[PDB]
Amino acid sequence: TRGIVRGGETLKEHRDRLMAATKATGRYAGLKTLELREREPILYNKLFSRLRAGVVDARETAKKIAAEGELCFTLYNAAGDSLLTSTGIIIHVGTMGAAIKYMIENNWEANPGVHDKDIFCNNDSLIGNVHPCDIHTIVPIFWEGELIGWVGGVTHVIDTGATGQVQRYSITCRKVGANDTLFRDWLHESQRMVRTTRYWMLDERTRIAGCHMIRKLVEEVVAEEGIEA
Amino acid sequence: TRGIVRGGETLKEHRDRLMAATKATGRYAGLKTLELREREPILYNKLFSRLRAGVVDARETAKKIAAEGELCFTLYNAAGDSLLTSTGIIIHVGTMGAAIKYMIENNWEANPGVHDKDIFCNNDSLIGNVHPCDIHTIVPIFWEGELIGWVGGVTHVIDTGTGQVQRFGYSITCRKVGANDTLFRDWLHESQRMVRTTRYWMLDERTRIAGCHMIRKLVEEVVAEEGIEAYWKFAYEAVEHGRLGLQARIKAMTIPGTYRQVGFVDVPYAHEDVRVPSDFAKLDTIMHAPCEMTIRRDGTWRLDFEGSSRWGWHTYNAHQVSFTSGIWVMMTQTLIPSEMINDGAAYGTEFRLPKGTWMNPDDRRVAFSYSWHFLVSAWTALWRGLSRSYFGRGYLEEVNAGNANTSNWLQGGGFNQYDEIHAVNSFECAANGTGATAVQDGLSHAAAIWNPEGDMGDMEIWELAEPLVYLGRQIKASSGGSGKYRGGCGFESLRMVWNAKDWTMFFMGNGHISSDWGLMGGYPAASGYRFAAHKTNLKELIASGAEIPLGGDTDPENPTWDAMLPDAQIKRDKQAITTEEMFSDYDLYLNYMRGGPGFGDPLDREPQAVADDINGGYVLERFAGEVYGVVVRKGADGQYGVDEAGTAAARAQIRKDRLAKSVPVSEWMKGEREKILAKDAGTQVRQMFAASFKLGPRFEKDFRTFWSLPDSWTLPEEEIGVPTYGSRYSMDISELPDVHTVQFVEE
């Protein structure tokens, strides 16, 4: 299966299919019936209740890496569509989802490539973001070598830069880490966008910690309740 | 081997060793002898010749992607030291060298790692760079798995991203933008948002990577034919060679001793036409760049800038890397005009840039977008210092009073005659006047300090790039510094806005102060001023056959254009720096390029040279008698001629008038001292001194001693009545953790 998405589809082939089914049927992904919800209700309510709780857990746990509320985490499917969102202000569900759909449409799969344990960062103005200082961390979730979803973590950094501005710091879905390790040139380069180093560094450690917690959550849920479900 | 450098040293173990040997011996890498050069002269000469020739070929071949500028390429050894630089402006040899030395001192080797076929990009503000838009591409060179050097390529992108005052208005810190000779897509998409037009940034990246990879192959072929053993010696002997070359030139052309000079330039940010958003930034300030030059018997020399002024809320500050790296574009024009120029010269020169000054701010808020304004104003004084050595030794041909301020930078923005974004400006300030020589006049409209190959450009080419039309292009009368030999005159061009939409323009250059000085009797070049006309009603004036402004502003004390434009809003003043201002079709913009300083007593100038200057438009008739003492008479053919007898009497009369109106320096001093004690001077003067004292204790002591001032007298900046934000509270770079900057300078 060449495409990284589960089944062999590429990210764009996958979303393109789902979007064509949505436009045609008036129902997301062309789902005229919800087999899992109707035939396995308990298991269906269990996945949501458990994922929702595990996501909330990641947000509140990571929150203890400073001392905000704009902090928030979201779980996406492979196509960049929100399934669940942690406690917090939900302005950034679409902005981060748009960052995911940007990587899908602009062939991030071939370059710089989307691999397991990769760390992405984004705040791009042209992709769309509420504030220039609201920084996104996006991690892909894999299962048995195939991509099954994304995690997005956002924080409002208080000490960035830029007066009486009249016209337009841009991070365009940059791969800032691999093997769950951040690149030094990215860390040094980021400490020049900010006035004080503390807030930027703890916020990134917070976002990543929460993303990885949600990644482990999915891996654990999938393992216990099966990837089919 | 463990480390990636040839031999098994890490990049830092390797450099630290060379730097330790450089300190203990005074010779780069502790090379008391250059075995390759001495034992194998031909192979050594051939290594430079081929490498120099291949580095130039890369620059010219890669250049062929246009529709030359700051374009340049440099070959470095493993420690980040330059060996050879291509044709072009060499101000970036040290900036890119610093970028390599930054990766070395911050363990890039471990993360993100330095591998063959990697591509690094950089323009960092804190590492050191002349302009934010000057983008570096750096490629490592490997031989049989081990690193043996680096390649650097730089361009000046012309369409990247009003009234900046703080740095927080782009930055690339040695980012790994590619691997396996292939650029990363996230970098391509991200860097095209850092720019208003895509075409210029994209081609420039191709060019840099092309030249780099050519030079990379160029080294791999040289090392293959001549062997790695030979090249490895050359990559360190060539640097120690450059040091010896500079030392030999000093001992041969100059004189040992101490030379003292200073330079100034204005920053008039109090004027309403300087629309800066920060109110603490709106004040008049003056740049203070004193320099004590020490040339030593052993051929070493020292440039100490003790006493300089503090950095300010503006874009004219500089970096210690930017100051020292760029000072050699000037030095290679007089002392060391050599194609062997490399970092060896740097190791033969001592720089002291006091921490906190405008040339070494050590504060992260500082902006440096237009460093040239200060740099060209501070470097010119060094011409005069060196010239004293040339003059005393007898090499008068090398004497030069100094470089003109590279000013009026015509800048415009909006939509051009093609209904497209403006990107290319004229850039006529590449041809300013040059300083006078001890032998002959200076060259008019001929060069800039950062490029002696001055090119003015064709009017017909600029009108294809700008929505402007030339109504005049003329030599700037009386812009050259008066003297026995006249400083080179600038020139001027009158622009009319034509087929521009959403158009804006601003002026950029020295105004109240002439940065350059004349030498040994010569006078400074003319200072700058602004002329612009809005709502001119020129369309109706042209149609009706009325008087229309043409040519240049011959005599701004008696202008002829203003009366021709009665309905116009005319701005004519000394405000040579403004922020973006709205312009529209049929408005006027005078682009005035500065002249160079003069040399010698003006009334020693041969009278026929004065008459030739009036007829040639280099000097307004008025000053022929007042400045030079020459009596000229208009003839039948309209040309001016010399009145031999009348001149002799005028020269003899001026000499008596000089002795009459003059005063003994002892007398004048006590009068100036009363003004100092009463603190009688503009705020800009007091702020300059107050800030210069705090950063330069040795300067304050000399000032107090010279003027015999009591300790009771103090000049606290906080009591002048102007904003002083940033004078006592700072944002050091030491606050940033995990960041190790390298010191090329005493402070």
Add this chain to the structure above:
Amino acid sequence: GLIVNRGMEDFHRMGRAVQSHLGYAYEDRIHLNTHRYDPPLVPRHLTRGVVERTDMIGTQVIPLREDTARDAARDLIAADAEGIVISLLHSYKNPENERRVRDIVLEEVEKSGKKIPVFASADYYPVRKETHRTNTTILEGYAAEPSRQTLSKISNAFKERGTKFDFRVMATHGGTISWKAKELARTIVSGPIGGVIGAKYLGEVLGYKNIACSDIGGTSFDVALITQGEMTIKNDPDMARLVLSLPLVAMDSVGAGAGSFIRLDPYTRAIKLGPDSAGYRVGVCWKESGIETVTISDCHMVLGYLNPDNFLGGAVKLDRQRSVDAIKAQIADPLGLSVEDAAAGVIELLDSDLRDYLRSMISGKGYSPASFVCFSYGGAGPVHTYGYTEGLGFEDVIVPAWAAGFSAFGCAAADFEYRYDKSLDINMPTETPDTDKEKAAATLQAAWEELTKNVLEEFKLNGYSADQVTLQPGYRMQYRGQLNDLEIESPLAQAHTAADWDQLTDAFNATYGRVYARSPELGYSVTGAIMRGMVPIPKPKIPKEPEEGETPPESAKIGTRKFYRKKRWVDAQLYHMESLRPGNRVMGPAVIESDATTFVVPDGFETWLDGHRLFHLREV
């Protein structure tokens, strides 16, 4: 005299600033105090201005004020101007104003009764860049007629000794013209561009499409490339420290010839060649010449490449011992080398400089030397051919038997061809309606017609009618945004339809791919139209002898000489070049001598002579 736009009277005398440092070596270019302005062609007191402005697309922003043109004309006439040049901005696009001033000047000249020629730049060099154009147009009103007198005498000197023909002169674009042509600024070329025309001439005969020319003289090293039968033209060159508007055959100078001086830097001890040369005076081996600094020729003496007794057939008495003495003191002893290793070392550096420049020059065009043949000519060419061709992999290395006069042979091989150029600015998307393609063809066609008039008028004054002239239309086209160095020979004599335009675009995509990564998507631009007109003339006939045995006649052997190379002294067999027969082979070490040339063939090399009397150098 000179009439330009009012308010811009100075742009000529300002020399665009660049003219203060044209023709300088690198170290002089950066050494500011070396810069110097030559006096302007036209002084300020003979320059006047008319009130007028036409923008880049021909729009008249400021209509011409004709009374300012009459006063300007009257002033220059009153100053007794022996010629009036007119150059207004963008007159190449809309010459209406410039040609009206022209008519006004002509009128005021008539009224005066004085003979004063008038030169409108739009009538002579209608191309962009006012400094290039005005300089070139001034040469017509400044140096043309005086040079006719100069060459009338040269042609007369030959007539009164036998010649029964009119001499032709070389022009920048590679073609030859009459010495009394309407535009003689094109004869300002003095370099050896003939060598490139000669090599291209031989190429057509021998089927060599890719030639790398190397003219090694006593005063210059010159190189150039003929790629796919066509040579490169530089359209805005600089000559005589003047920016000009003349199509010039492109050559690259690499040094100052075999007469280049050899010095050691006083600060660096680096071996430095040139930039100045002894030229005619050979070197210090010529006692009577007064040269005191060693030259590359002196190195050839020490190394035994040149014959002391046979320099120019023995007209120059050279003493090798002087070369041995001067190289010992100036180069060898300071470097701790022997006199032989020093001389050998210099030649080694020079060979690598030439080698690198040819390799990179070929590589810059997108080729490898394996696709190219190298022509090594000039008096000193055959002396280094082995050196700067080693291991490059040229398909073939050739040394013409007439190498010493190959450049002059090329001037004879050039066509009797006039050329005229005009600037254009056609902008065309890939996909447009035939209406826009018809207008594009009309613009280019109208230019071809105005140029044809100039070409044919040049020939009529030479006695040739239009039916005798072969016209070759041309144009400079490129993909929008991508500059190139190509000139396209139009496949059509004229163009009118939208299908004729597509034929011109395809003609470019064909030549482009034939020389080289195309980008037809961005569209096309036409920045200039070209018109060339040729008349048949007698060209030098190529020898075509039957080849004989491969052993040279014993009478061709003329002794032996020892030369030093690879740290070894070697006994070389001397041969008399013109005694060698086609088919003959010569094994190295050997030195094939002529009266004005020396072809060195060290051991490890071999050369054979063909029926065309061309030597082929191989590496065995």
Add this chain to the structure above:
Amino acid sequence: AYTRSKIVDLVDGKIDPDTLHQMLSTPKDPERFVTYVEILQERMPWDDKIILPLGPKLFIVQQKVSKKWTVRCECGHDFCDWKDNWKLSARVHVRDTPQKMEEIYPRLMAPTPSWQVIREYFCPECGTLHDVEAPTPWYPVIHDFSPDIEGFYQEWLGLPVPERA
């Protein structure tokens, strides 16, 4: 080396361009200084040995009798000891008003006296302008050059140092 007459023309600014280009582009002649000072010595109205020129008409001289080194004007006026700044013993004219400025510059092209001032330092005897400073108000008088004559003659020129008192 260059002919003495050629160096004379350099001193007078009558040198031709070809030789002037040679001097700039070719190795410097070490004998320049000795020839240079000898030419200047031959045109002084006094016979005190020049040891270093400081300007077209300003030199450090060896007083014939006392052997003390002093700064001296071409007309013969002694300013001070060679270690001291000659300007402190000269006469000055400061252009600190627009009126003064506009005598040497056109208006608008003239520096603004409240930012920059022109200091004209003259010889008290002949009224020769030996140097012009262009600093800010209050700025000290500049001591332009402190030559190391001993090391210059001895280490570089290979000459004996003149006698000094």
